[PDB]
From a paper:
[name] is a key virulence factor of enteropathogenic and enterohaemorrhagic [name], playing roles in bacterial colonisation of the gut and in the inhibition of lymphocyte proliferation and proinflammatory responses. Here, we describe the structure of [name] from enteropathogenic [name] O127:H6, determined by electron cryo-microscopy at different pH values. We observe three conformations of a highly complex molecule with two glycosyltransferase domains, one PaToxP-like protease domain, an ADP-ribosyltransferase domain, a vertex domain and a delivery domain. Long linkers hold these domains together and occlude the catalytic sites of the N-terminal glycosyltransferase and protease domains.
The C-terminal arm adopted two different conformations. In conformation I the C-terminal arm was shorter and more compact, while in conformation II the C-terminal arm was extended. At pH 4.0, we found the same two conformations with some 40% of LifA attributed to conformation I. The ratio between conformation I and II did not change significantly upon changing the pH and conformation II was the most abundant conformation at pH 4.0 and 6.5. Vice versa, conformation I had disappeared, which suggested that conformation I was a low-pH form and conformation III was a high-pH form. The rearrangement positioned the ART-domain at different locations relative to the N-terminus: In conformation I, the ART-domain was folded beneath the delivery domain. The relative arrangement of the domains downstream of S1 (S2–S4 and ART-domain) changed between conformation I and II. In conformation I, S3 formed two salt bridges with the vertex domain (E1759-K2782 and D1757-R2877). The C-terminal subdomain adopted two different orientations relative to the N-terminal subdomain. In conformation I and II it formed a compact entity with the N-terminal subdomain, which was stabilised by a hydrogen bond between the subdomains (V1731–Q1776).
Numbering used by the authors: 241 to 734, 751 to 994, 1119 to 1885, 1897 to 2153
């Protein structure tokens, strides 16, 4: 306790050295003393004498602390409410003046807000009309009678301005009608009303910003009203009449009051003469309160706090009188003979108060209202008043104590005898305080926070509107209840309070709790004790309160004009309402509510002729670009900068005001768009710990919490060893001025090592040294080398590391994930809102660790242990920031730097470059300051070419120079503060951005003073500070607004598909998908499979939400094309491991970040029943929803997958991300197709998670009550995915028409990019200059991949070989043998293309086969060594692909079970085709090519011969050979070679089926027969030796590469060498095969078999003819139609850049009905009538009488064909 006693001594000694102990500093010192003494009490010492001594000392400190009391000022304050009658106020004012002789009465009057009631009423009318219109015209399911009646009575008023009381009565009746409306409609009404009123207030504040006004008066309000709507002179006359009436009433009342009493005794104080009114921290909340209030006859809650803070004294309402003296109560008790009914019930007390007030004011006592009072009570009250009237006027009332403790605000406490008992509570209608009290400041801050949280409904874009929160009197101003109260007040005209007594009590309790031990007497069971109030009555009787000797003297609040009598007795005035027909609304002047494009025909309507002639042409040049910027789904900052700069220039170059207002409306639209377009945040958290605390418990808790919150979140712990060394050196220098190195190094090393080994098993936690990744020329490196030690080094390091590409969240505090709604709900069972915050640390300790606390019930522990940790904590995923790039945490509305949330990788980050340049400038100023060489000239020169020059004012330069002279060595933050005057670098971000955004940035900065959130402030906080568990957001509460947990789909350890084998799933099911979609009536089926997510974790929610967002066919097509492009890019990047250009990588990262965020949001939304309705799969209910309930979108959720049903235009489109989309005319058809697709296919059913399950209870449909909800949840910033087509590098390079001269040959830039030409380690994105050409290198992997899928001409191969021989292969990539770069003639291009396609298919199938084999081998009880060795391979079942093998594990382990029906079926089909070929010359070229490639792969696997992976590959080869031998060796010859047999079969096929196909088959057979080529063997050996071993990729990729090598070796037989200068012209066309026509198959059809088998043969012929109508090779400019057989009357038009193909497809026909393509299978069956209507779909004839061959006309790729 040397860390307690010494500071106790010094704080005591400082307490002596206080000339005036009656001050806040003395109170703080005493608080510190008592806190340290209580900390000493917490020790384990058991000495009772010590306990007594310390408690006596604490009592002494408390007694000394309470000895400091302040005498309040002799001021009595009251607020005059507009429209108040002066007769009911003068009596109470006179009573208070008479009772308080030595007091000054001040009546606060706001002369500028006399007519604000009519302005507020007009705004409310506009807001309610807008809400009604939004409800009506967006609810097409049914009409609402309430809106119709509202419009009818408004139209009835439109003809009778004269009488309005009838209108208010009709509105009351209409509210009685409205009470019966449905609950969701009520919630929507409340939300829309509140949001519209807030938006109108924002519009008024924006108008104030335009006009540049400093104060707000009634003239400005009238001008704004004329701006928004049309005001006749009668409305202005009524406004002025009510203003004059209020002025005259106030003047007459004050004159009458000053005639009797003194002139200076009572006076009028102007409300506008208040400092707090113009304070920027108050956000002009006084003006907002005039609109969002429902207790209009009462006074302002903020104004009384302002008055008490700035002046001090007593505030009282104008309906209260001083408390009765002892004599009065005494006489009442004797006159009532001891009955307590006359001192407790409201009616008799009110009558007695009326009598006393009448008697004191020299009025008629007999005229007291004795209503609802019995006659005997009337007589006894009369005699009581008669006895009282004999008393002197100076003893009727008693004063109150004016001595209060320093920094305290006593609050009046009331006792009301309700029929159910007592209703003790505090009232803000009578308060006491002195000037400058701290508790008033705390209450004001609480009120500001309350208004901030109330504005959350409008400020938060992603705010849910269907959230029926329970009634709990929570601190959050529940928007639903407040909106309902406001609607009731607007309609009816007659609880919760954002700044009422409840908030005052809560803030006072918080202040007293933060006081410490001295505040313990103010706390009474976590509430406010009796010492915090006045008028407290002690209950001497069992329950009755002794009305004789109260603890404190209060005030008689039961008066004839109190809150309970003015509701009925005082009718609503007619001077606080102004009826206006909203139909004349000017929607172009309201950018906050209406998004209006600039229309040149009507934009310049009210402009002056001079301004029109000046700048109409200039503005008309902005219409297209401005509209594109407004309607875009992404932000292009260059266009935004240009448009904003020139709009600002035009604005500054004007003299008119209407045109200025229109341009400001455009700027406001720009600002709103900037606000609304948020971007995702990477799922990364970076913590910069302070290694000087010796307590890593908080850091470990933070790491554990962020680990448990999500299993994908990366955690980076970043520390600087150089900073620790500099700190140690500075400490050594200080110790010297005022062994060790080894000790400090060991200490730091052991701390870091402990942190590292605590989370060693977690790969997501990485501890990194900052100095290891820092550029040498960077500012941070120079600061490290200069011994920078200042505290802001960590903030500068955070900024630098973000600038280095480390995205995510950067913070220094030990942040903890915020609790989710489930955890708060669990804790709420036996806790209140004020105890959950204190109990949260225990729950967090029990969740992350496994510590059990005795202070928490075991039920809580049991309920928490049953839920996953990720369901109770909020992860970093799903967060978002402003489009500017960076976000900051807030503290009481001011942005801080505790948490920095920095965008997502791939998105534009304008703030990052500004911060980088600003830090460079600050470092330059620092180095100039250090050497004392900083004056004005070099200061201006340093920022001469810098954005930060905007801060160079004369006073800023003077301050910088003065501080440099005073202290040459200053921190960078201090330099920035001196230069700019802003507290933090975060504040300077908007100022820096305003240089490039002169108008929008200035407007956004100005709007901060009117309550709008800062543009760089994060609102939804997913983090909490460890010490208090308080959120770091702007307007959020972590307890009453906790986020909903997200449903995480648990996946298997092994996935069914990888990226290599993923297309097999689509290929196996695409035909069935199309057939069954067409059979159910779909007239448009489109295919666009996704290759982005190969694992069903997340259930494809992101893609489903992306497709659901689009509301049009054009946007749908754009999004589908963009998703296909991104899928291709992802396949190239990940499956092939090929480098990508910067733009393509950025696009992929943006798309993946959006997909992850959207999938998280969708999984969150589906599990929350309050947002989206959820129903089980029922076709009738879904049809009713889509037909009667006005539902246009829905999410069909299988346990593993998600589908989308939409209502684009008039069609109903169903989207399956894995396949594509098909649209139907009616919803029932789509639902039937969905159900059929789910049930019919077993593999698809198992993959989707519905295997052996009832789908009527395992399929859920998610929809919204209204279509607005989707617009609210789905983000607006789509990165341009659904509005514009994103072009890759190849697409842009294809537009260039100039070639590049490389190695003496000119080739296009696109071709150079395709072959992998890398410049300076990057793939070329632009035509390289002649200087950079010698530095060009060819990427081996890219070149190999290009050669894999390209059929070059011999000249192209020659050119590629020349380029390779001149430039070479980039080091570290795949070497390429020049002899492998060959070309083919025109007649073999189709064969080469089919061979390459077969190679791809075989690779994809063998990848899955190898994965299955590896899983089988891993399922074996292995011990050690190379024991796994297959002993025999044979296929027992030829019809199913079952192989039996034995393993020489050494323990005799045998598992003879593996299903490989892929290799077996290929050879089965080959044998069948070979045997049946002599009967009819029908063969499959693709099947033969695939068989040849597989055989060659096995043969290459033979030569050049042991872990599980290579064993599996060798086993696959062995099974290939075994299947080939079984299905090809008819006779058991020992000297049997599979290659020879396959070659002989191919030669037989080629001889019997001649032509170019026969030539290709002969070439492949010859390749198989001959020994492997030297080049092929060299390539195989080089790969297997160096390239596979060097890379760490999976074995599947290596196997696929080997298969590709084998297929390339097969492909070498179809190539030919170039011929130079051919002397003679030869024939270069393909040769037709024997049996092209349909007579060949018809010859075998004539064999007497089943008729349906003959039709199957005919259909096979038709499908083969339609499969290969066109083969396009735009690289060579070749079009191949030789495979066309069933596309008649073909017309090829090469005039257009994409050639047009037209023709007639072969079709099915029926004898009676003919060909009817427009009908589905069921309609065709009904027409023909060949079956029953209840027959299964499998019993029908699919494709009958409605089939076409080909299905659709093929599309020729764009190119130049010769």
């Amino acid at each position: 306790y040397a860390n307690e006693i010494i500071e106790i001594k010094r704080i005591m000694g400082e307490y002596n050295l206080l000339p005036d102990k009656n001050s806040r500093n003395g109170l703080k010192l005493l608080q510190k003393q008592a806190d340290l003494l209580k900390i000493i009490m917490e020790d384990t010492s058991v000495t009772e004498n010590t306990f007594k001594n310390i408690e006596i000392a604490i009592t002494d400190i408390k007694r000394e602390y309470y000895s400091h009391t302040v005498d309040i000022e002799k001021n009595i304050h009251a607020i005059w409410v507009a429209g108040s009658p002066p007769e009911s106020i003068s009596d109470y004012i006179k009573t208070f003046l008479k009772t308080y002789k030595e007091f000054t009465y001040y009546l606060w009057v706001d002369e500028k807000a006399f007519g604000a009631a009519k302005f507020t009423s007009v705004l409310k009318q506009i807001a309610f009309d807008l809400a009604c219109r939004t409800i009506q015209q967006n609810t097409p399911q049914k009409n609402i009678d309430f809106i119709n009646l509202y419009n009818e009575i408004r139209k009835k008023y439109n003809n009778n301005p004269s009488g309005q009381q009838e209108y208010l009565n009709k509105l009351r009746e209409l509210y009685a009608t409205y009470q019966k409306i449905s609950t969701p409609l009520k919630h929507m009404f409340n939300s829309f009303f509140l949001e519209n009123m807030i938006k109108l207030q924002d519009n008024f504040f924006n108008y104030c910003i335009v006009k540049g006004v400093t104060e707000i008066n009634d003239e400005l309000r009238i001008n704004y009203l004329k701006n928004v709507i049309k005001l006749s002179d009668d409305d202005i006359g009524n406004y002025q009449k009510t203003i004059n009436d209020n002025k005259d009433r106030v003047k007459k009342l004050i004159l009458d009051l000053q005639k009797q009493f003194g002139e200076n005794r009572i006076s009028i104080k102007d409300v506008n003469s208040l400092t707090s009114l113009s304070k920027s921290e108050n956000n002009h909340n006084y003006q907002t309160e005039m609109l969002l209030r429902w207790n209009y006859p009462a006074a302002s809650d903020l104004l009384r706090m302002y008055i008490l803070k700035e002046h001090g004294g007593i505030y009282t309402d104008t309906d209260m009188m001083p408390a009765y003296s002892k004599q009065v109560i005494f006489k009442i008790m004797m006159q009532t003979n001891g009955d307590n009914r006359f001192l407790e019930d409201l009616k008799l007390r009110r009558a007695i108060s009326d009598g006393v007030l009448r008697y004191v004011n020299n009025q008629n006592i007999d005229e007291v209202n004795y209503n609802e009072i019995s006659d005997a009570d009337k007589n006894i009250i009369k005699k009581i008043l008669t006895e009282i009237s004999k008393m002197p006027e100076d003893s009727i009332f008693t004063k109150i104590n004016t001595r209060i403790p320093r920094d305290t605000m006593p609050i009046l406490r009331r006792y009301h005898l309700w029929p159910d008992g007592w209703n003790i509570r505090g009232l803000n209608g009578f308060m006491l305080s002195h000037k400058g009290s701290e508790v008033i400041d705390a209450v004001i801050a609480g009120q500001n926070q309350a208004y901030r949280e109330l504005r959350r409904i409008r400020d938060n874009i992603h705010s849910e509107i269907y959230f029926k929160q329970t009634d709990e009197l929570s601190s959050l101003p529940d928007t639903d209840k407040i909106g309902g109260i406001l609607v009731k007040k607007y309609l009816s005209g007659s609880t919760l309070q954002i700044s009422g007594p409840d908030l005052i009590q809560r803030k006072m309790l918080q202040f007293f709790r933060s006081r410490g031990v001295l505040g313990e007497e103010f706390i009474n069971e976590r509430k406010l004790s009796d010492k915090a109030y006045i008028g407290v009555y002690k209950t001497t009787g069992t329950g009755k309160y002794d009305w004789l000797t109260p603890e404190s003297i209060g005030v008689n609040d039961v008066t004839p004009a109190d809150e309970s009598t003015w509701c009925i007795g005082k009718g609503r005035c007619v001077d606080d309402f102004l009826f206006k027909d909203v139909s004349t609304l000017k929607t172009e002047n309201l950018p906050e509510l209406f998004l209006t494009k600039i229309d040149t025909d009507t934009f310049f309507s009210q402009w002056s002729t001079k301004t029109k002639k000046d700048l109409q042409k200039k503005i008309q040049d902005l219409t297209v670009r401005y509209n594109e910027l407004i309607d875009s789904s992404t932000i292009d900052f260059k266009n935004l900068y240009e448009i904003d700069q020139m709009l600002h220039m035009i604005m500054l170059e004007m003299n008119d005001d209407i045109a200025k207002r229109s341009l400001f409306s455009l700027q406001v639209q720009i600002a709103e768009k900037i606000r609304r377009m948020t971007i995702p945040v990477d799922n990364i958290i970076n913590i910069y710990p302070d290694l000087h605390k010796k307590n890593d418990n908080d850091l470990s808790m933070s790491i554990k919490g962020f680990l448990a919150s999500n299993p994908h979140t990366k955690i980076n712990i970043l520390y600087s060893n150089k900073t620790e060394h500099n700190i140690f050196i500075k400490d050594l220098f200080s110790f010297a001025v005022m062994a060790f190195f080894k000790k400090h190094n060991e200490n730091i090393h052991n701390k870091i090592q402990r942190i590292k080994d605590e989370f060693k098993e977690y790969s997501r936690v990485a501890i990194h040294n900052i100095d290891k990744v820092i550029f040498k020329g960077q500012t941070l490196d120079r600061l490290y080398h200069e011994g920078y030690v200042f505290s802001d080094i960590n903030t500068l390091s955070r900024y630098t590391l973000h600038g280095l590409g480390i995205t995510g969240v950067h913070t220094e505090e030990n942040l903890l994930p915020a609790p989710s709604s489930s955890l708060i709900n669990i804790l709420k069972e036996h806790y209140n809102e004020d105890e959950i915050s204190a109990k949260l640390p225990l729950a967090y300790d029990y969740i992350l660790n496994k510590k059990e606390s005795s202070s928490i019930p075991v039920e809580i522990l049991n309920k928490l242990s049953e839920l996953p940790p990720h369901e109770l904590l909020t992860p970093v995923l799903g967060q978002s920031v402003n489009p500017l790039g960076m976000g900051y945490s807030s503290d009481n509305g001011k942005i801080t730097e505790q948490v920095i949330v920095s965008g997502a990788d791939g998105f534009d980050n304008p703030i990052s470059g500004l911060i980088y340049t600003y830090l460079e400038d600050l470092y330059n100023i620092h180095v100039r300051m250090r050497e004392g060489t900083l004056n004005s000239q070099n200061l201006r020169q340093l920022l001469e070419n810098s954005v930060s020059s905007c801060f160079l004012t004369e006073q800023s330069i003077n301050k910088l120079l003065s501080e440099a002279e005073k202290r040459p060595y200053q921190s960078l933050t201090e330099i920035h503060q001196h230069l700019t005057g802003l507290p933090t670098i975060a504040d300077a971000t908007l100022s820096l951005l305003s240089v490039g955004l002169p108008g929008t940035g200035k407007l956004l900065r100005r709007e901060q003073d009117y309550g709008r959130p800062p543009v760089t402030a994060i609102q939804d906080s997913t983090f909490v500070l460890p010490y208090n568990f308080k959120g770091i957001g702007f307007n959020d509460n972590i307890i009453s607004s906790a986020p909903v947990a997200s449903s995480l789909h648990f996946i298997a350890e092994h996935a069914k598909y990888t990226l290599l084998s993923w297309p097999e799933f689509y290929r196996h099911h695409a035909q069935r998908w199309f057939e069954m979609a067409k059979g159910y009536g779909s007239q448009n089926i489109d295919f666009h499979p996704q290759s982005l997510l190969v694992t069903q974790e997340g259930r494809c929610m992101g893609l489903a939400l992306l497709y659901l967002q689009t509301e049009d066919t054009a946007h749908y097509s754009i999004l589908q094309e963009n998703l296909m492009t991104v899928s291709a890019l992802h396949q190239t990047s990940n499956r092939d491991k090929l480098p990508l250009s910067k733009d393509d990588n950025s696009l992929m990262t943006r798309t993946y970040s959006l997909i992850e965020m959207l999938q998280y949001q969708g999984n969150k939304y589906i599990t929350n029943e309050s947002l989206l309705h959820k129903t089980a799969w029922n076709q009738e209910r879904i049809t009713l929803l889509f037909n009667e309930k006005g539902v246009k979108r829905a999410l069909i959720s299988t346990p593993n997958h998600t589908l989308v049903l939409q209502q684009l235009e008039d069609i109903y489109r169903l989207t399956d991300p894995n396949f594509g989309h098909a649209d139907f005319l009616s919803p029932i058809d789509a639902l039937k197709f969905i159900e059929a697709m789910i049930q019919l296919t077993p593999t698809l059913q198992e993959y989707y998670g519905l295997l052996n399950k009832d789908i009527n209870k395992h399929i859920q449909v998610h929809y919204a009550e209204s279509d607005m909800v989707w617009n609210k949840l789905l983000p607006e910033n789509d990165a341009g995915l659904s509005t514009r087509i994103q072009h890759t590098t190849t697409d842009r390079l294809a537009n260039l028409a100039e070639p590049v001269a490389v190695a003496g040959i000119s080739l296009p830039v696109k071709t150079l990019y395709d072959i992998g030409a890398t410049l300076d380690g990057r793939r070329i994105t632009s035509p390289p200059t002649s200087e950079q050409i010698p530095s060009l290198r060819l990427n081996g992997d890219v070149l190999n991949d290009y050669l894999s899928r390209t059929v070059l001409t011999p000249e192209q191969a020659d050119n590629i070989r020349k380029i390779l021989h001149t430039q070479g292969i980039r080091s570290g990539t795949r070497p390429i043998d020049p002899e492998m770069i060959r070309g083919t003639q025109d007649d073999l291009v189709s064969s080469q293309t089919r061979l390459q396609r077969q190679a791809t298919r075989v690779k994809q199938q063998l990848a899955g086969v190898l994965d299955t084999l590896q899983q089988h081998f891993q399922n074996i009880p292995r011990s050690s060594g190379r024991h796994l060795s297959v002993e025999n391979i044979e296929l027992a079942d030829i019809g199913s692909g079952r192989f039996n093998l034995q393993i020489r594990d050494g323990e005799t382990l045998h598992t003879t079970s593996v299903e490989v029906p892929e290799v077996v079926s290929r050879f089965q089909k080959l044998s069948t085709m070979l045997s049946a070929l002599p009967a009819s010359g029908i063969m499959d070229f693709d099947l033969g090519m695939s068989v040849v490639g597989v055989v060659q792969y096995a043969r290459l696997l033979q030569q050049g011969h042991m872990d599980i992976k290579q064993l599996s590959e060798a086993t696959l080869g062995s099974m290939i050979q075994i299947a080939g031998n079984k299905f090809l060796n008819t006779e058991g010859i020992q000297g049997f070679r599979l290659e020879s047999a396959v070659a002989e079969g191919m030669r037989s096929v080629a001889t019997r089926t001649g032509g170019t196909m026969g030539k290709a088959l002969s070439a492949s057979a010859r390749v198989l027969e001959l020994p492997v080529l030297e080049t092929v063997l060299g390539t195989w050996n080089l790969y297997n030796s160096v390239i596979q071993l060097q890379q760490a990729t999976s074995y599947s990729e290596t196997m696929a590469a080997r298969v590709q090598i084998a297929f390339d070796s097969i492909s070498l037989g179809l190539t030919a060498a170039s011929v130079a200068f051919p002397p003679l012209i030869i024939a270069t066309g393909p040769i037709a095969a024997i049996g092209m026509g349909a007579s060949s198959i018809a010859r075998n059809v004539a064999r007497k078999e089943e008729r349906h088998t003959q039709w199957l043969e005919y259909k096979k012929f038709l499908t083969d003819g339609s499969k290969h109508i066109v083969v396009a090779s735009p690289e060579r400019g070749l079009l191949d139609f030789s495979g066309n057989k069933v596309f008649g009357k073909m017309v090829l038009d090469l005039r257009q850049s994409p050639p047009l193909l037209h023709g007639e497809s072969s079709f099915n026909a029926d004898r009676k009905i003919g060909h009817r393509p427009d009908l589905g299978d069921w309609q065709i069956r009904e027409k023909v009538g060949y079956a029953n209507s209840i027959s299964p779909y499998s019993s029908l004839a699919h494709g009958y009488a409605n089939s076409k061959w080909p299905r659709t006309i093929p599309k020729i790729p764009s190119g130049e064909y010769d």
